[PDB]
Design an enzyme around this catalytic site. Sequence first.
Site, PDB file in Angstrom:
ATOM      1  N   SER A 112       0.762  -1.222   0.099  1.00 30.21           N
ATOM      2  CA  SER A 112      -0.182   0.138   0.036  1.00 30.21           C
ATOM      3  C   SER A 112       0.959   1.124  -0.424  1.00 30.21           C
ATOM      4  O   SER A 112       1.609   1.225  -0.920  1.00 30.21           O
ATOM      5  CB  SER A 112      -0.919  -0.069   1.109  1.00 30.21           C
ATOM      6  OG  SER A 112      -2.064   1.183   1.178  1.00 30.21           O
ATOM      7  N   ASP A 167     -10.066  -5.589  -3.883  1.00 31.19           N
ATOM      8  CA  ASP A 167      -9.379  -4.479  -2.944  1.00 31.19           C
ATOM      9  C   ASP A 167     -10.170  -3.444  -2.659  1.00 31.19           C
ATOM     10  O   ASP A 167     -10.611  -2.522  -3.704  1.00 31.19           O
ATOM     11  CB  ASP A 167      -8.052  -4.064  -3.377  1.00 31.19           C
ATOM     12  CG  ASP A 167      -7.129  -3.287  -2.403  1.00 31.19           C
ATOM     13  OD1 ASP A 167      -7.691  -2.679  -1.730  1.00 31.19           O
ATOM     14  OD2 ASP A 167      -6.106  -3.727  -1.968  1.00 31.19           O
ATOM     15  N   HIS A 201      -7.292  -5.768   0.363  1.00 27.86           N
ATOM     16  CA  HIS A 201      -6.131  -5.228   0.852  1.00 27.86           C
ATOM     17  C   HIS A 201      -5.460  -6.018   1.711  1.00 27.86           C
ATOM     18  O   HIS A 201      -5.308  -5.655   2.827  1.00 27.86           O
ATOM     19  CB  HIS A 201      -6.613  -3.843   1.414  1.00 27.86           C
ATOM     20  CG  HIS A 201      -5.613  -2.803   1.344  1.00 27.86           C
ATOM     21  ND1 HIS A 201      -4.894  -2.473   0.002  1.00 27.86           N
ATOM     22  CD2 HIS A 201      -4.622  -2.143   2.283  1.00 27.86           C
ATOM     23  CE1 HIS A 201      -3.980  -1.431   0.315  1.00 27.86           C
ATOM     24  NE2 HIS A 201      -3.941  -1.352   1.676  1.00 27.86           N
TER      25      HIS A 201
END
EC number: 3.1.2.-
Length: 223
Positions: A112, A167, A201
């Site tokens: 990320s 995600d 995620h």
Amino acid sequence: TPLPAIVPAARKATAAVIFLHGLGDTGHGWAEAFAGIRSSHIKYICPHAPVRPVTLNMNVAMPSWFDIIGLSPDSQEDESGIKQAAENIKALIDQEVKNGIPSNRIILGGFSQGGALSLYTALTTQQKLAGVTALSCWLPLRASFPQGPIGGANRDISILQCHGDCDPLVPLMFGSLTVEKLKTLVNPANVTFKTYEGMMHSSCQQEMMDVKQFIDKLLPPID
């Protein structure tokens, strides 16, 4: 700047993987993941991001490499923080070079916003790195990069980018958009995009097998 979580080289470090965690985390969790896929000759450095208010969530304090203002490819970005963080990473890379690990034996990566920082640094450092592993991330400050090949040391850098198709935080669309811009800044013959059915995620074990493959191929033992 506390001591990073480090998976050290069994004997002498001949390569290094510098990996940066995502929002609100520490390096301990990822160091463990890399402990489970480590090569004896590779030093795995997972530094810890400083706690700080994050605009995205009413300035609630939590570990963050820089401020997050939005979640859209059109969102305003923390230009100063992104650039200073990148400076810190190059500083951390310089240290590993002056201590025995040549830069072209170092891989940068992250998850990320850690991955985003990884991409931005690799593409603005004159230090020639061995590769980048950018998991579920994006390219910060897209529109500041010229529209041709970057030049410099990492014209031909190898990039492994991974994303889950479910995600909710960094949409797969944003990663797809990032790799397309990547393929115009570096040699797309070394740009690999990996998609993971059902992953959110998060990470999965196959993604970690493909990261191991990537690192072992690019950072083989000297002996």
